[PDB]
Inverse folding.
């Protein structure tokens, strides 16, 4: 059950009661498609049903030709060199590309083809060492050699029935689409499409993964999230086997507390126009308890939320001491230096929270919260304020209409004096772009000594 | 007719003569697909035409199974917690998700199925209250029960003709694609694809909307823009009816003046290398008059422009006093504090405007404007300059070639002394990341008192 | 062969040994599809094979109707008005849109239709002047007039065979998909899909381009990259011809040296918590020698890397003096003012380089580098450090696991004192958001004079 608290002193709000699901590692799985080496199509026929099989066979041959141009290139994701700019930089698919390099080595391909001879699903120990679960999803070699073979290799082609022309177009379409996606994605796609892996196959891949029963239940009830956080890496096409690597999210952190810290600018409301100072907490984002520290996601838009569960990637996190949470109840606590910025602003805005809305209303801006049946129900005055989503349908700031989340949950309004009122405007360090409480303090004592 | 003005004093340019089209509200509409509860397919047949119907029936059943995994999850868009970082934060699909929650309630589904029994287009008052326009686009229940029913439910299957196998694949493809998109988008897509709503159906949905005749004409002549600003929200699949919510843009603001303010860095050009100071207007973006204020879009790349009309979302806007426009003619006006930043830069760049190009040329950079038939026609000197797009095809700065817009329109070069020349470099507040004219002034008077 | 160097003094690393491929200009090519003006389909027939041809003919007519709504609108890409925010602003498709405006003029269409009457590939001089290579990829007019004509125009329709219903659906699908993409992209797509241009046609378009043999070899071995950097611009549909403009990357810069500069924060490691100062190089990104200057891409994620070649767009570059490279060996050199920022940070992070990983480890964060078979092999201490990818599989910082690139190459650890140790914390300009070595120096001398 979700709850929420607003801190009038620091113009922020925390939504509590969420559960974690943090991508920590990667499970690399091999997907294979058995092909037939169709060098040529010896058939003169002008028969309409043969003409359509030759057309679908050219697309197949062209798809193979297209895919060979891709396996000859090293696939790669290109990465860099409020607080998101402090984030580390990691190669997102370095594990999958390492496995893709193993599939290029001679004989390694033959190991895969042989393991999937009797079953379409088997575990394989690779030459380098990593144990991967291989799965054959399409046996076009078998189909062509059993249905389309008598029509090729003979100049006098035995004309096929209409249902084979249609069924071949059906089976071949998957290969053409897998090729279509790799052709515009430089051999690396994400999310993984239902052509790379159908919902049927994905679930079957999950239930056979070396993971706990908790994780199997979790990934299956959130397959749409698994796809968005997965990659499909084109690998090899040789010796009648097309292989592409699928990289699936591992959730090493599950069911730990998560909260979302919302922040908005806190300014003075003096009638004198330029005499106002401002202060804004920059530690907003998702927080989840994680191994005695707190995983901090400074760009909450990167996480994905399903009901009350939060799906994030630790690649988008900073690892903070748990004391960072003291900034919500006491931004002046002596145990963690709470981050703020102090660029002046005279613009109004609202932040829609999980169960309410923060309103930073300044200047001459109209700021209200309304109900569809009753119109305006609260009028915000200058400063930073909050309203609960109970009985409220919309919030308007200026010419911007916000809808509030109608999620069920109790909100708590923690009254407090705006901390912006404690500072003398004559010695306030404005335009600190990425500072903190202590940094402002020690800059104030330096400007006071100079005076 | 488009015009433009360049202010040599503040290194900026304003393109005038545009018309607004601002997304203010949302029109939620229900799209439905009548299905048949096909529990099983009792048929032993090895006939090729029956084998292909069983194959297409499995895809249908799997699509339903896939969609049920999605209706069991709460759909959500994940949002945050030059001046874009001052923007509010709103749930983009909170209205559609509220309607999606109403469709989950018992009996509410039966209301929809009954209203669309005789017509495929009807208005429905929901239990909560909002009046929504429901539209049935596919009756697969009717098709299967009228063409595919005699082949199932009988162990001795009456074999169907080839044209029914093909036509069933045709009709069923739309359902498989709608499912395909929701499966990789966590049940929320945007833009709305032609599978969610065909151009035929969208226009028919627009002409029946409760909106003015002006808005009907507007949305129809810009359907490609309507799609990009729309969402499709998976809702429910129960009682033989699949329902997904489509959220369409409401344009409460139309035909008001719009102008695009372009800005580029203004620096001194002293021969002494480190003695130079810089100044850059940070109020660039789209501006549109809106209800006595001015809607300001600080990230112009979010708006979409079609001929001389500007399509923006008020969710991406700040609401400023109209006096903000005084910064173009007089950046020192006493009625609005014009925003600037003062980080030093020695790099050159160009901004391609609607009818010309601004050039910030500094250091040893080659800056020219050429014509395809005649080569270089103007050579920029150090400082901030401008050239009109008449007779000019390209602008080069350093190793970067810019093409200019060949749009027709008159440009006006407003000569003026660069305001960067009015400041003493010895007491200039460099590296003000988000300041303003007054903030620089009062920081200069503080550094002068200390001296 | 790739190499790399880490500078312990400035907490940065440079990967050397790459080759350039810089998009400088645009090659505009015209793609055409010959259509038939099918006003109406005079046929009463209830025959199943005729019903399916009427269905596929409606989709064709609707696709034309949809495309006419798009040619009536001016296509446009919407653009703006660490160091990426200093980048110029250019219209990405201004050249293609200029050609699209030429196709709208009367008689210009007839010139194209006539040039492609005998061949499906010919060069055309346009009325304005630019020489463009036109290519007809689909002749649906010929197909309908030769196979589907006897079934229309007659009330007593000669019923067609089943293979023509299927083949018409096959040929028509490309048109429906081209229309599908333009309908959700406001008539401008990128990357160019295989429906806009198949891998077969693209290569054929490349080999016939007016470019050097080096460039033909380059673009063909990297077709997946060409597509991602290409645009497809809907143009005209009139006089039985649909024309859309394809804009292809021109690589004026090839085979010049490229290096990727990685940077991470450099801080003091005093036991006193708030007494620490920090410094971070902001010149990270891709660098490539380019015409005696250096093209600098401050957002390395925009470039695309294939093996050891770097594909970038000069539109995403700044043109710097080559002396900028002196910041790697001597950040204090007197010939270029090296850019830094000095916002304090106490968070740890790692940057995965081409051949190793930088680790900025501060506070109480666990920072290690492990091997899959042997576990932790190095433990980082507070400060900024580096480890080579030889023998190392992963790096962990806090709760974040990074995989290292297993690329082959030698790394060089250039020992040096952290330059952050040279500054007195009592007069250090913290929170300089975009400064440089000289700017910090001259601000230190001003704070010292005040003291």
């Amino acid at each position: 059950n979700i709850t929420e608290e607003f801190y009038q002193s620091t113009c922020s709000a925390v939504s509590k009661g969420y559960l974690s699901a943090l991508r920590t590692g990667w499970y690399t799985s091999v997907i294979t498609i058995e092909l037939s080496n169709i060098k040529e199509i010896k058939c003169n026929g002008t028969d309409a049903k043969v003409k359509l099989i030759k057309q679908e066979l050219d697309k197949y041959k062209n798809a193979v030709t297209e895919l060979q141009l891709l396996m000859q290139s090293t696939p790669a994701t290109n990465n860099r060199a409020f607080l998101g700019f402090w984030l580390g930089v990691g190669s997102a698919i370095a594990s999958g590309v390492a496995v893709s390099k193993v599939l290029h080595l001679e004989g390694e391909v033959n190991k895969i083809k042989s393991a999937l001879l009797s079953t379409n699903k088997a575990v394989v120990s690779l030459s380098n060492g990593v144990s991967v679960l291989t799965s054959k999803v399409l046996d076009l070699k078998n189909y062509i050699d059993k249905q389309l073979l008598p029509i090729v290799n003979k100049q006098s082609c035995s004309i096929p029935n209409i249902e084979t022309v249609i069924e071949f177009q059906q089976k071949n379409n998957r290969l053409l689409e897998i090729t279509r996606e790799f052709s515009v994605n430089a051999g690396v796609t994400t999310p993984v499409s239902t052509y790379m892996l159908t919902n049927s196959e994905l679930l079957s891949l999950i239930n056979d993964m070396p993971i706990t029963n908790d994780q199997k239940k979790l990934m299956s009830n959130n397959v749409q999230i698994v796809r968005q956080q997965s990659y499909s890496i084109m690998s090899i096409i040789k010796e009648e086997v097309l292989a592409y690597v699928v990289q699936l999210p591992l959730y090493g952190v599950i069911d730990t507390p998560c909260w979302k810290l919302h922040t908005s600018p806190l300014c003075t409301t003096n009638t004198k126009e330029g005499s106002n100072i401002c202060l804004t907490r920059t530690d907003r984002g998702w927080y989840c308890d994680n191994a005695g520290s707190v995983s901090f996601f400074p760009q909450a838009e990167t996480c994905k939320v399903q009901s009350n569960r939060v799906f994030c990637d630790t690649m988008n996190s900073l690892t903070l001491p748990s004391e960072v949470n003291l900034c919500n109840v006491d931004i002046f606590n002596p145990k963690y230096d709470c981050k703020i910025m102090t660029s002046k602003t005279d613009v109004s805005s609202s932040v829609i929270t999980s169960l309410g809305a923060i309103v930073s209303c300044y200047g001459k801006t109209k700021c209200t919260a309304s109900n569809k049946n009753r119109g305006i129900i609260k009028t915000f005055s200058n400063g930073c304020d909050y309203v609960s989503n109970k009985g409220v349908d919309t919030v308007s700031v200026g010419n911007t209409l916000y809808y509030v989340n109608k999620q069920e949950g109790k909100s708590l309004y923690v009254k407090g004096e705006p901390i912006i009122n404690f500072y003398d405007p004559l010695v306030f360090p404005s335009d600190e772009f990425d500072a903190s409480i202590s940094q402002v303090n020690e800059k104030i004592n330096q400007s006071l000594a100079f005076i």
Observations:
- Chain A touches chain C through 68 residues (CB under 8 Å).
- The two ends of chain A are 53 Å apart (CA to CA).
